[PDB]
Design an enzyme around this catalytic site. Structure first.
Site, PDB file in Angstrom:
ATOM      1  N   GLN A 124     -10.073   5.241   8.879  1.00 49.14           N
ATOM      2  CA  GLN A 124      -8.711   4.622   8.153  1.00 49.14           C
ATOM      3  C   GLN A 124      -7.517   5.376   8.542  1.00 49.14           C
ATOM      4  OE1 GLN A 124      -6.414   2.275   4.754  1.00 49.14           O
ATOM      5  NE2 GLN A 124      -8.539   2.367   4.681  1.00 49.14           N
ATOM      6  N   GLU A 156     -11.586   7.408   0.412  1.00 43.94           N
ATOM      7  CA  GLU A 156     -10.373   6.823  -0.099  1.00 43.94           C
ATOM      8  C   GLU A 156     -10.229   7.044  -1.416  1.00 43.94           C
ATOM      9  OE1 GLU A 156      -7.007   5.138  -0.983  1.00 43.94           O
ATOM     10  OE2 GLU A 156      -7.469   4.680   1.116  1.00 43.94           O
ATOM     11  N   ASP A 162      -6.168   6.941   2.310  1.00 47.17           N
ATOM     12  CA  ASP A 162      -6.059   6.792   3.635  1.00 47.17           C
ATOM     13  C   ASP A 162      -5.080   6.684   4.453  1.00 47.17           C
ATOM     14  OD1 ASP A 162      -8.790   7.637   3.115  1.00 47.17           O
ATOM     15  OD2 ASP A 162      -9.716   5.802   4.022  1.00 47.17           O
ATOM     16  N   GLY A 165       8.467   4.913 -12.520  1.00 46.40           N
ATOM     17  CA  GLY A 165       9.795   5.407 -12.321  1.00 46.40           C
ATOM     18  C   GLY A 165      10.661   4.447 -12.346  1.00 46.40           C
ATOM     19  N   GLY A 166      10.597   2.978 -12.587  1.00 43.04           N
ATOM     20  CA  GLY A 166      11.624   2.012 -12.784  1.00 43.04           C
ATOM     21  C   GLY A 166      12.054   2.085 -14.146  1.00 43.04           C
TER      22      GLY A 166
END
Ligand code: NA
EC number: 2.8.3.16
Lengths: 427, 427
Positions: A16, A139, A168, A259-260
Site C-alpha cells: 500500500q 499498517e 500506509d 486541534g479544533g
C-alpha cells in the site's frame, strides 16, 4: 500538460504505502513502470479478491496509471536490464527491507555512478538510525508506534486504530513530498538524492497536536478542553474516577475536538438502527450567542457559568447532552442544514455507501469510475489536489507482465533478444 | 542547499492545515512571510496557552521557520503593499472561507495579472463545485465528511475520531504535494497555477482502503476479515448478533487489520492502570507455524480448522483472546521481543510521554528541541522525510509583527514611509 509528464519512475513497490505514492505520481502524469516478481507479482493482486482469479480491488485501486513488467532480478540478464532502466529513470521507488537493494547489487553509490540524475526514494518502518530501524511494520503497527493508537478511542477502552491508512497511504503521500522536493533542487544541482520516509515519522507528523498536549500536560498538569477536565465525568471500567490529578501521558478523549474547537459526536434520528446517523457538532468560543439562539437558551448568553470556555469546563459534556436532545427527530443532513443557518461548524458522519454513490464527489473527480474492460469498471479515489491547468486521466491497473515486451522494446532490444529473455525465464 | 531555497511564500494561513503546509516548506528552505491581522494575529497564539501572554505551544509547533508581518488588508495602503509582495512571491497560501480572498481584493484573475508566475494554493473544506462547498469544516468535521469516523471505532459504539490530525495537518501535507507539483510544471510552462485541496478529499484519500471494502461488500455481501464475519461474535446494543447478512455499508471493525494482515490490540501487564500497556499483534497467513511455536500450540499447525485464513474466520477472535492470556505477566516491550524471536512483527502502543522523550527520535531529527530564547525551549516534530543532501535547521516561531520593518525594507520602503505606515495603523 501535466506536472510530471516526462518523469520516468522505476517502481519496485508492493502492498500500500509505496504503490499509493507511485500511483498518485502517475495521476499527475509520471511514466510509472512497476517491476514485479516473475510469476506472482504484488501480493495485493491475490489479497481478498472479490471474483476468483481476478486482480483484487486492493490491487486495482492502488495500481492505476502504471505498466507492469516481470523481472527475475537474481539473474545476470535481469541486473543488466535494471542498469539500462536506471539510466532512463528519474526516480526509483522501493519498500524492501533494510539493505535489500544493496544486496541485489545496487548501492546508492553504484546507482549514482549509473545515473547522476536519478532520485532513490524509500518507504521504511522506522527511521535509519533508530534503535528499531530493521524490523517490520504493518499498517496498525505504525499507528501504534507513532502515538495515534494511544490517543485514539475512549478513556475506558483500549488504544484504537484509525480506519484511515495513517500508516500506509499517509507514508506514501509523505514520500511523494520528498520525491517532489528532490525534483525541485535537481533543477539547480543537476543531481539526484536519496530520500526516505519512516512510517513512524509520517504518523508522528499527523500526531503533532498530541505532542503539543504532552508538553502542556507536563507544564500545567491539565488539558482543560479534554472530557477528563470536567469534574466527575470520566470513569474507568471499574468505576474509578479519571481526572488530570493522576494523568501523566496524553489520554484518549473520545470524540473531543483535538486541534479544533471543542466538539462531540451527537446522535441523530435513526441512530439505534443506523450506525452512521450522527453529526459532529462544534462549540467555538466565539459562537456562544449563536448556539444559545439555536437551542433556545437565551438565559445562557449573559451567564458567566456558560458564556466563556473557562466557565464551561465543569459542564461541557452536560451541554453536549442537552444539544443532542434537539436532534432526536432530525436526520444528520437536516441537522447539518440547521447548524449551517447559524454558521456553526457541524457536519454529518458520511457512510462509505453514501460516499461511493455521492454525485458531488464524482462531479469534482475525487471519486472516479475507472474504465476496465477486462475486470469490469470500478470506483477509485482520484487526485485530492485540484489544478487550474490540468486534470488527471485515470486508466486501468495492469495485468501481471502485460507491458514486459513493450518496455523491453523501449530499451531498444530486438525481437531475437526479447525471445532469449523469455526462453531464459528472465522475463 | 535546501530544496526550496529561494522560494518566496506569501503566507496568509492560520490555525493548523495551512500553517502545517507553510511550516514544512520553511523546514525545506522556503522564505515564509506570515501575514497576520494587526493586534491579534493567528488565533493559535492565544489558544490554550500554558503561560499568560506567551504564544501557545499550538502556535510555536506550527510556526517555526517563518517571519511575521502585521498588516491591515482592509486599508488601501495594505492592499498596495500586498500587490508588491505578490510580485516578489512564488507561492501564495491561504485557508480563509470560500470567496474570502476574492472579497479582500484578490481574485485568481487579478493575481495572474500582478504576477504570471505566482502559484495560489488553498485549503478548502469541500471541493469547488461540491453541493457542500460553502460549509465550514475543521479537523473532526472533515474526519466525519471523508468516511474516517464511520469506519473507526467499535460496532457497538459511536463513530470515532482519530487523535491524529486526519483533517488539518493531513490536508496541509496534501496541499504541499500540490504546490510542489505546481512548481514542477512551472519549470516547463513559466506560469503559475491555482491548486486546492479539500479536507474531505484528503481524508478520503487516506480512507481509500474502506472504499475498497465498500465495493467488496456491495459485490459479495461479506468482508471475511472483519470481526462481524465470525458467526455469533459481534453483538449490538440490545444483545442481537451482527452479521454481514444485514450490513450494506462498511462497518466499524474495532482493532481489525485494515490494509494489513488480520490483527488485534492485545492487553499486556499493567493495562488496568496504564492505558497504553498494549501491543498490536498480527496473524499473517504464512506466519501461522511460527505463531503456533510461540504460543505452544503444535496441534494447530496441521489442523485445517486453524492453519488457513478460511479456517480461522469462524474463530479468529477466540484465537486472539487465547494469545492475549500469554501476555498477562509481560510488558509490551517484553512481548515484542518474545514475538521477534519467532520472526513475528509485534508492535507496542507508544504513549505520548514515551515518544516525547525517546532518545532515538531525537537522534534522527524527528523529535526536535527548538532553541527559543524568548519563550524557553520546546519540542516539535521535524521533517518526516530524510534526505542525503541536507538537514533542516529549525528556528523558533516569530513574535507578532516581529519582522514587519525588516520585510518592508526588503520591498524598498524607506524609514519615512515605514514610519507613516505605523502612524496610519496599516502595519
Ligand atoms: Na431560537
Amino acid at each position: 500538460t501535466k506536472p510530471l509528464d516526462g518523469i520516468n519512475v522505476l517502481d519496485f513497490t508492493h502492498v500500500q504505502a509505496g504503490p499509493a505514492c507511485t500511483q498518485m505520481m502517475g495521476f499527475l502524469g509520471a511514466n510509472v513502470i512497476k517491476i514485479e516478481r516473475r510469476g506472482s507479482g504484488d501480493m495485493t493482486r491475490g489479497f481478498l479478491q472479490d471474483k476468483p482469479n481476478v486482480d483484487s480491488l486492493y490491487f486495482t485501486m492502488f495500481n492505476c496509471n502504471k505498466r507492469s513488467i516481470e523481472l527475475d532480478m537474481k539473474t545476470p540478464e535481469g541486473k543488466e536490464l535494471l542498469e539500462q532502466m536506471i539510466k532512463k529513470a528519474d526516480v526509483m521507488v522501493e519498500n524492501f527491507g533494510p539493505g535489500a537493494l544493496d544486496r541485489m547489487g545496487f548501492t546508492w553509490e553504484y546507482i549514482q555512478e549509473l545515473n547522476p540524475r536519478v532520485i532513490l526514494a524509500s518507504v521504511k518502518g522506522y527511521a535509519e538510525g533508530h534503535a528499531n530501524e530493521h524490523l517490520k511494520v504493518y499498517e496498525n503497527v505504525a499507528q501504534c508506534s507513532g502515538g495515534a493508537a494511544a490517543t485514539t478511542g475512549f478513556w475506558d477502552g483500549p488504544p484504537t486504530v484509525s480506519g484511515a491508512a495513517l500508516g500506509d497511504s499517509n507514508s506514501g503521500m509523505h514520500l511523494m513530498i520528498g520525491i517532489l522536493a528532490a525534483l525541485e533542487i535537481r533543477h539547480k544541482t543537476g543531481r539526484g538524492q536519496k530520500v526516505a520516509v519512516a512510517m513512524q515519522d509520517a504518523v508522528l507528523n499527523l500526531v503533532r497536536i498530541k505532542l503539543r498536549d504532552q508538553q502542556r500536560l507536563e507544564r500545567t498538569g491539565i488539558l482543560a478542553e479534554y472530557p477528563q477536565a470536567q469534574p466527575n465525568f470520566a470513569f474507568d471500567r471499574d468505576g474509578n474516577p479519571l481526572s488530570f490529578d493522576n494523568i501523566t501521558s496524553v489520554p484518549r478523549g473520545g470524540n473531543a475536538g483535538g486541534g479544533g474547537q471543542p466538539g462531540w459526536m451527537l446522535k441523530c434520528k435513526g441512530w439505534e438502527t443506523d450506525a452512521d446517523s450522527y453529526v459532529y457538532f462544534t462549540i467555538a468560543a466565539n459562537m456562544w450567542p449563536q448556539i444559545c439562539d439555536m437551542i433556545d437558551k437565551p438565559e445562557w448568553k449573559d451567564d458567566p457559568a456558560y458564556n466563556t470556555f473557562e466557565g464551561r469546563v465543569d459542564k461541557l459534556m452536560d451541554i453536549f447532552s442537552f444539544i443532542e436532545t434537539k436532534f432526536a427527530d432530525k436526520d444528520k443532513f437536516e441537522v447539518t442544514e440547521w447548524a449551517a443557518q447559524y454558521g456553526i461548524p457541524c457536519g454529518p458522519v458520511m457512510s462509505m455507501k453514501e460516499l461511493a454513490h455521492d454525485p458531488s464527489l464524482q462531479k469534482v473527480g475525487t471519486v472516479v469510475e475507472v474504465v476496465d474492460e477486462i475486470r469490469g469498471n470500478h470506483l477509485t479515489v482520484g487526485a485530492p489536489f485540484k489544478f487550474s491547468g490540468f486534470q488527471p486521466e485515470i486508466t486501468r491497473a495492469p495485468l501481471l507482465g502485460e507491458h514486459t515486451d513493450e518496455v523491453l522494446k523501449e530499451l531498444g532490444l530486438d525481437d531475437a533478444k526479447i525471445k532469449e529473455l523469455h526462453a531464459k525465464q528472465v522475463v
